[PDB]
Scaffold this active site. Structure first.
Site, PDB file in Angstrom:
ATOM      1  N   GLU A   1       3.119 -25.526  -5.906  1.00  0.00           N
ATOM      2  CA  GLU A   1       4.425 -24.879  -5.917  1.00  0.00           C
ATOM      3  C   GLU A   1       4.365 -23.645  -6.799  1.00  0.00           C
ATOM      4  O   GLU A   1       4.203 -23.755  -8.019  1.00  0.00           O
ATOM      5  CB  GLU A   1       5.501 -25.846  -6.409  1.00  0.00           C
ATOM      6  CG  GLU A   1       6.913 -25.308  -6.324  1.00  0.00           C
ATOM      7  CD  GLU A   1       7.947 -26.346  -6.709  1.00  0.00           C
ATOM      8  OE1 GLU A   1       7.554 -27.453  -7.133  1.00  0.00           O
ATOM      9  OE2 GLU A   1       9.155 -26.068  -6.569  1.00  0.00           O
ATOM     10  N   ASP A   2       4.458 -22.473  -6.175  1.00  0.00           N
ATOM     11  CA  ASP A   2       4.693 -21.225  -6.884  1.00  0.00           C
ATOM     12  C   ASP A   2       3.537 -20.871  -7.805  1.00  0.00           C
ATOM     13  O   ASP A   2       3.540 -19.804  -8.423  1.00  0.00           O
ATOM     14  CB  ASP A   2       5.985 -21.312  -7.689  1.00  0.00           C
ATOM     15  CG  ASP A   2       7.198 -21.449  -6.812  1.00  0.00           C
ATOM     16  OD1 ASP A   2       7.085 -21.174  -5.604  1.00  0.00           O
ATOM     17  OD2 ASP A   2       8.264 -21.838  -7.329  1.00  0.00           O
ATOM     18  N   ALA A   3       2.550 -21.748  -7.909  1.00  0.00           N
ATOM     19  CA  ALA A   3       1.517 -21.559  -8.910  1.00  0.00           C
ATOM     20  C   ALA A   3       0.364 -20.763  -8.332  1.00  0.00           C
ATOM     21  O   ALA A   3      -0.402 -21.263  -7.506  1.00  0.00           O
ATOM     22  CB  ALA A   3       1.025 -22.913  -9.409  1.00  0.00           C
ATOM     23  N   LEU A   4       0.208 -19.533  -8.802  1.00  0.00           N
ATOM     24  CA  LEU A   4      -0.809 -18.658  -8.251  1.00  0.00           C
ATOM     25  C   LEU A   4      -2.160 -19.161  -8.738  1.00  0.00           C
ATOM     26  O   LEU A   4      -2.234 -20.055  -9.582  1.00  0.00           O
ATOM     27  CB  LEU A   4      -0.537 -17.218  -8.668  1.00  0.00           C
ATOM     28  CG  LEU A   4       0.535 -16.464  -7.880  1.00  0.00           C
ATOM     29  CD1 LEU A   4       1.903 -17.083  -8.072  1.00  0.00           C
ATOM     30  CD2 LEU A   4       0.572 -14.994  -8.285  1.00  0.00           C
TER      31      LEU A   4
ATOM     32  N   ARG B   1      12.484 -19.641  -0.577  1.00  0.00           N
ATOM     33  CA  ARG B   1      12.913 -18.442  -1.278  1.00  0.00           C
ATOM     34  C   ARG B   1      13.245 -17.337  -0.292  1.00  0.00           C
ATOM     35  O   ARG B   1      13.936 -16.379  -0.651  1.00  0.00           O
ATOM     36  CB  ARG B   1      11.832 -18.013  -2.264  1.00  0.00           C
ATOM     37  CG  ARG B   1      11.671 -19.053  -3.326  1.00  0.00           C
ATOM     38  CD  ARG B   1      10.526 -18.812  -4.262  1.00  0.00           C
ATOM     39  NE  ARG B   1      10.510 -19.894  -5.234  1.00  0.00           N
ATOM     40  CZ  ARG B   1      10.017 -21.102  -4.988  1.00  0.00           C
ATOM     41  NH1 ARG B   1       9.490 -21.382  -3.805  1.00  0.00           N
ATOM     42  NH2 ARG B   1      10.052 -22.034  -5.927  1.00  0.00           N
TER      43      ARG B   1
END
Ligand code: ZN
Ligand code: ZN
Ligand code: ZN
Lengths: 101, 350, 48, 146, 49, 33, 97, 46, 335, 67
Positions: free
Chosen positions: B18-21, B202
């Site tokens: 989740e969202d973690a590059l 998003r």
């Protein structure tokens, strides 16, 4: 004769070839992906997998659970030296062409 | 402010989620996204009514030729100097003040106006910094004023906030080595490698266009305008891309970072401008074993910086009661909190 | 609800530790044409 | 949690337990505790611990499960249109539990036009990987998008 | 602001109820041992499991 | 065996704190209100 | 005096009353030692029912141990590493307290 | 030079006594900075 | 499927190898060699001093993929790592400046050295035939020649741009006498390390040491290495004429070719296309066209830093894997 | 501050090219990509940094401590 390279894992294996899990320390998907393709085309070989537990540290599990007939380690040995024969054939062709340009 | 960084939208390296590059070594190694971090610590030097200045004295040098490690952080000046790794526990300024400085002076003196309680300030922190610049100068009242600046560069370690400048606000995930994550045709390897799932909920396609525009501009050799209700539109890029041989959809095949086969779905990847933020983890990570206690309530101090301790709020606490743990309260809110024994009297309890 | 937690959650951990490589190895991604309506529907909606 | 030490610097958990914390990662700063006295240990781990609390009480529901990737990832391997061969399935079943396990291969999903296995199988083994696997399950329901 | 009030509501909503437990009679009681309810939900069965 | 088993192992056993779990449980996250 | 009306002459019923006022947040809400704080990052190959705690806090994040019997052949060693390297300890407390 | 340090603006090598004053000489300008040490220094680039 | 990956607009198909006798009721292509030895071949595209390209055939994904991997990572190389400074006044922070140096390539033959021990301390570490060190010191000098203003800051200021050519070297005992014919040379002798102006000087000596590319790209002898997996476009029906001439403008220039209107569109060659697949976007070319790329065939090229000849790179890279497997078999496994 | 000697992707040596690039832009003004294309840049990630990386050192040397 360094006692740290790979280790028979008694945890996973049962008996008599069949399942054997060999965790290779200090190695990567190079040897794993390279090797599995070789291994599986040995007839007795059935399940030859591998994975890293996690890139967060260097350890490499390789996996062979096969039939009866030959024995687990015997596969890895055999097809491994077969992967040596790969290397020779490679340099055989390649360096031949290049010296012949 | 940022890097112009190539990315491949993909869920690869399930460390992503989740969202973690997640990033590329032999890129971070190549200088990607690196940050010089500067700070300054001034120390005012003022005279005290006893008419004895606060002094910079230093340079002990016992041991025959060297100042002790703790005190080895300088040169004969008695103050920090340029270009030195300073490990926490060392002295980046040696400030000696008179322990009698605050006393009441009398119309007399003889020999020693010393009596110094020296309080040099010590660089504290996890990781070495550098003193590359310092300033001795004066304020308006004619007094000695010393100002030093300490710096350390931070390789972008695991756990750093990386904004995608389009609204994607994310931590750097588990840093890939090199081979892992794809390469494709010319061998161009993405740098940041990012989860698709951010984009659906998003619900931001602006970035998704921006990548197209990016792979475009380089290929025509231009910067690429975009602006509210304006800039380069999309359709033109198609021809712009296909002529030079990339799919107008802005997608391409890649090859397994591990396996080395074709990837089973075309990937959308290319240039995007990213940026690095405050809230670097190394600043933020905070822990204690037994830290100081505050005189009034006799218990751990406040927040980060000074020293640690963490907050069990009521609303936070009572969550444990739903599990009904007796002892976990005690060890937590008592034995590890304020350890005390009251002595009382059965008769008239007090 | 059957075999109890230790083996239950074990089924989870083997789940994730699968997906985290497999999803990655195969690959999955988005692309513009998936968001982009292709001719067609824009005429329908355009009337709607 | 049973704590395992790893390099770098940060707190790292297994994403499937995010939904209780609803942690978006990003700036989220957790609060890490270790207990001190013994009885509190066995208390927290063997009561308040994850596996025991695997269901959240209010709904009587298992709050913790796969999200996002692990879901959609499953949806690809699960997908009907997929297949796998002797190799592909092998390395998968490896990557599913990194090693450490004996296994057994159910008969191939297909036959004389080569051999294969479908996802439904290779996922079936995820539940019951072995003979000695005590996880005999029947299940049925509607998923969404039905 | 709704999350604000809601948090407060969890605080207070706890408070009045903050201590209520189940005793070996299957009779939920408070602390000072006035009885709030006899058989919990007429059931005595954890909604969790 | 299954049914009555689970039903028996599904019960409030004494000491588990209901009020708390209810506390935690409620709050989160023509004209009429 | 002053007399520009310094606002917070109040010291007391306050210090016992709200928010940071003790009897809620500084007593029932105690800010408790032996803890740690950091940002997060996903680790799927880590099992559920764990947390990866980085070595660098482990160095300063300590646990009390009463040695017994079985313990020595670990613990007698665990000292020889010392506080520096991870698989070690720092504080010791004898039986003579 | 191997003497101590430099102005801010005037930017010239200058020494100082102990407990004298910070004002430079070449310029009446007050503030000034410290020259980098002649001492060796070491990194490792990676 | 017949070593040809299925190529579609919305997906790709036919991936994993699939040549081994696991999955076939007719169990064939079980390892051996000879079938492979005599079968396997190779081609060469062309060579440079600093770059190579060639063609590969009749092998799987893996062993080639390994070759790429061990290439970009495992092949040893020698580069600057540890840095010494004699002061500096220049504007770049000595940190970044350092990080600039070792990150530059250096052309010197590796295997002229050994590996260095991690254990032994101090002077034991950096020693003679196991080690290199270089030094550079320049003070910018204002040129009394200033014909105009705003000229290049050399016409202003002598040696204000430091290049790789500027990097000099200190040979040592038995270290000097051995490289006399092969003095150290820094890849592209022109690279901007730093800029500066008179009154500014940098003096440094940093150790160039053997290393392994996987740990740092500055140890990569290979700028990039990749196998572009060879496409094969297959054609259907004459489909000739005007829109057939359009049909190539669909693709990159070389692609197929137009022999005659009646002689339609014939493939010139493959490998000149990016597989950018927009015969699938117009869709009216669809049923008369199909796409494919071949598992057994590898377009391959290697961008090497210029350290050694890239033919040496790939050639060595295999032997490193040979050393690996040979090394491994000889070691017995503990129980 | 000065063009990184290698890119963040290929890490092909950039350094030589910047000067030769910038000159090739000033002397004989010509199309950017084509310049790079006949300067020998192909890979776009390699390319971005020549199309980008505003030089801050030349705008710094305005300010310097020494003058
Ligand atoms: Zn009394
Ligand atoms: Zn001056
Ligand atoms: Zn590049």
């Amino acid at each position: 004769p360094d006692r740290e390279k790979i280790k028979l894992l008694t945890q996973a294996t049962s008996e008599d070839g069949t399942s054997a899990s060999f965790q290779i320390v200090e190695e990567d998907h190079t040897l794993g992906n390279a090797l599995r393709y070789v291994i599986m085309k040995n007839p007795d070989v059935e399940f030859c997998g591998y994975s890293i537990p996690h890139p967060s540290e260097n350890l490499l599990n390789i996996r062979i659970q096969t039939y009866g007939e030959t024995t687990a380690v015997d596969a890895l040995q055999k097809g491994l030296k077969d992967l040596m024969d790969l290397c020779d054939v490679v340099e055989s062709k390649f360096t031949e062409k290049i010296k012949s340009m | 402010a940022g890097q112009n960084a190539t990315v491949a939208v993909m869920s690869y390296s399930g460390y992503d989620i989740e969202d973690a590059l997640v990033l590329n070594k032999s890129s971070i190694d190549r200088g990607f996204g690196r940050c010089e971090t500067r700070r300054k610590t001034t120390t005012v030097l003022k005279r005290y009514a006893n008419h004895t200045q606060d002094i910079i004295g230093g340079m002990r040098v016992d041991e025959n030729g060297d100042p002790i490690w703790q005190h080895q952080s300088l040169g004969p000046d008695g103050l920090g100097e340029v270009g030195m790794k300073v490990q926490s526990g060392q002295i980046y300024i040696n400030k000696s003040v008179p322990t009698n400085s605050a006393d009441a002076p009398n119309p007399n003196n003889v020999n020693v106006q010393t009596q110094y309680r020296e309080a040099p300030v010590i660089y504290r922190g996890p990781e070495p910094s550098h003193i590359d610049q310092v300033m001795m100068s004066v304020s308006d009242n004619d007094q000695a004023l010393i100002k030093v600046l300490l710096r350390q560069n931070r390789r972008p370690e695991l756990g750093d906030k990386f904004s995608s400048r389009h609204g994607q606000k994310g931590v750097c995930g588990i840093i890939v080595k090199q081979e892992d994550m794809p390469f494709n045709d010319q061998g161009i390897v993405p740098d940041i490698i990012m989860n698709p799932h951010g984009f659906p909920s998003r619900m931001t396609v602006g970035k998704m266009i921006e990548l197209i525009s990016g792979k475009a501009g380089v290929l025509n050799g231009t910067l690429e305008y975009g602006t509210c209700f304006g800039g380069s539109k999309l359709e033109d890029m198609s021809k712009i891309l296909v002529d030079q041989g990339f799919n107008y959809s802005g997608k391409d095949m890649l090859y397994s970072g591990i396996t080395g086969e074709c990837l089973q779905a075309y990937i959308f990847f290319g240039p995007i401008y990213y940026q690095k933020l405050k809230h670097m983890v190394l600043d933020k990570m905070h822990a204690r074993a037994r830290g100081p206690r505050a005189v009034l309530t006799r218990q751990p101090t406040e927040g980060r910086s000074r020293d640690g301790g963490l907050r069990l709020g009521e609303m936070e606490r009572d969550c444990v009661i739903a599990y009904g743990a007796s002892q976990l309260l005690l060890e937590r809110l008592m034995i590890s909190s304020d350890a005390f024994e009251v002595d009382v009297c059965d008769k008239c309890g007090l | 609800r059957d075999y109890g937690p230790q083996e239950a959650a074990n089924a989870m951990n083997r789940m994730a530790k699968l997906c985290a490589r497999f999803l990655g190895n195969r690959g999955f991604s988005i692309g513009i044409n998936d968001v982009t309506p292709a001719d067609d529907l824009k005429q329908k909606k355009e009337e709607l | 949690h049973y704590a395992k030490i790893r390099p770098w610097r940060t707190f790292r958990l297994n994403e499937c337990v995010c939904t209780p914390y609803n942690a978006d990662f990003d700036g989220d700063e957790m609060n890490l505790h270790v207990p001190q006295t013994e009885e509190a240990r066995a208390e927290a781990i063997n009561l308040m611990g994850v596996k025991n609390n695997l269901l959240t009480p209010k709904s009587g529901e298992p709050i913790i499960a796969a999200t996002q990737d692990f879901i959609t990832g499953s949806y690809l391997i699960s997908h009907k249109d997929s297949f796998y061969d002797r190799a592909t399935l092998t390395q998968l079943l490896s990557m599913m539990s990194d090693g450490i396990e004996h296994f057994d291969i159910p008969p191939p999903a297909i036959m004389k036009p080569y051999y294969l296995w479908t996802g439904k199988q290779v996922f079936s083994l995820l539940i019951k990987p072995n003979h000695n696997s005590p996880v005999v399950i029947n299940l049925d329901a509607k998923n969404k998008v039905f | 602001v709704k999350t604000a009030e809601t948090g407060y509501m969890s605080r207070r909503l706890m408070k009045s109820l903050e201590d209520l437990s189940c005793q070996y009679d299957n009779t939920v009681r408070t602390s000072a041992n006035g009885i709030v309810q006899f058989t919990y939900g007429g059931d005595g069965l954890d909604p969790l499991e | 065996e299954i049914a009555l088993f689970k039903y028996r192992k599904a019960r409030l056993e004494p000491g588990t704190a209901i009020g708390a779990i209810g506390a935690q449980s409620i709050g989160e996250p023509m004209n009429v209100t | 005096n002053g007399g520009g009306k310094v606002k917070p002459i109040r010291g007391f019923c306050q210090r016992l009353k709200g928010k940071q006022g003790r009897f809620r947040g500084n007593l029932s809400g105690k800010r408790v030692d032996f803890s740690g704080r950091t940002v997060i990052s996903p680790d799927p190959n880590l099992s559920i029912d764990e947390v990866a705690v980085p070595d660098r806090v482990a160095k300063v994040l300590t646990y009390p141990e009463k040695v017994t019997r079985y313990n020595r052949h670990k613990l007698q060693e665990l000292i020889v590493n010392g506080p520096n390297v991870h698989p070690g300890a720092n504080y010791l407390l004898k039986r003579n307290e | 030079a191997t003497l101590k340090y430099i102005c801010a603006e005037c930017s010239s090598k200058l020494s100082l006594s102990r407990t004298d004053a910070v004002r430079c000489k070449d310029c009446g300008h007050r503030i000034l900075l410290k020259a980098r040490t002649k001492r060796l220094v070491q990194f490792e680039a990676r | 499927m017949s070593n040809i990956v299925g190529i579609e607009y919305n997906r790709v198909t036919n991936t994993t190898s699939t040549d081994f006798p696991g999955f076939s009721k007719d169990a064939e292509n079980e390892w051996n060699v000879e079938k492979f030895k005599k079968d396997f071949e190779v081609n060469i595209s062309s060579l440079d001093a600093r770059e190579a390209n060639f063609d590969l055939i009749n092998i799987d994904t893996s062993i080639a993929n390994a070759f790429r991997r061990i290439m970009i990572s495992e092949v040893p190389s020698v580069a600057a790592e540890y840095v010494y400074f004699f002061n500096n006044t220049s504007v770049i922070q000595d940190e970044v400046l350092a990080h600039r140096i070792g990150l530059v390539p250096l052309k010197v033959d590796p295997d002229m050295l050994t590996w260095v021990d991690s254990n032994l301390p101090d002077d034991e570490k950096f020693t003679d035939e196991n080690t290199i060190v270089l030094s550079l010191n320049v003070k910018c000098t204002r040129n009394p020649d200033a014909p105009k203003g705003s000229t290049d800051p050399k016409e202003l200021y002598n040696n204000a741009h430091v290049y790789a050519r500027d990097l000099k070297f200190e040979p040592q005992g038995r270290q000097s006498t051995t490289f006399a014919d092969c003095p150290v040379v820094p890849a592209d002798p022109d690279i901007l390390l730093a800029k500066l102006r008179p009154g500014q000087e940098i003096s440094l000596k940093a150790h160039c040491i053997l290393g392994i590319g996987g740990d740092h790209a500055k140890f990569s002898p290979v700028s990039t290495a990749s196998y572009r997996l060879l496409p094969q476009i297959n054609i259907l029906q004459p489909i000739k004429g005007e829109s057939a001439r359009r049909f190539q403008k669909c693709f990159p220039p070389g692609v197929i070719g137009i022999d005659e209107g009646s002689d339609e569109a014939y493939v010139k060659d493959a490998r000149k296309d990016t597989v950018s697949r927009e015969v699938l976007r117009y869709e009216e070319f669809a049923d008369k066209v199909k796409l494919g790329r071949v598992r057994n065939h590898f377009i391959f090229n290697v961008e090497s830093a210029g350290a050694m000849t890239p033919e040496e790179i790939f050639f060595k890279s295999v032997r490193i894997l040979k050393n690996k497997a040979e090394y491994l078999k000889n070691c017995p496994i503990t129980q | 501050m000065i063009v990184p000697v290698r890119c963040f992707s290929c890490g092909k040596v950039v350094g030589d090219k910047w000067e030769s690039y910038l000159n090739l832009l000033q002397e004989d003004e010509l199309d950017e990509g084509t310049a790079l294309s006949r300067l020998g840049l192909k890979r776009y990630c390699c390319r971005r940094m020549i199309l980008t990386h505003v030089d801050l050192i030349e705008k710094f040397l305005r300010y310097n401590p020494l003058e």
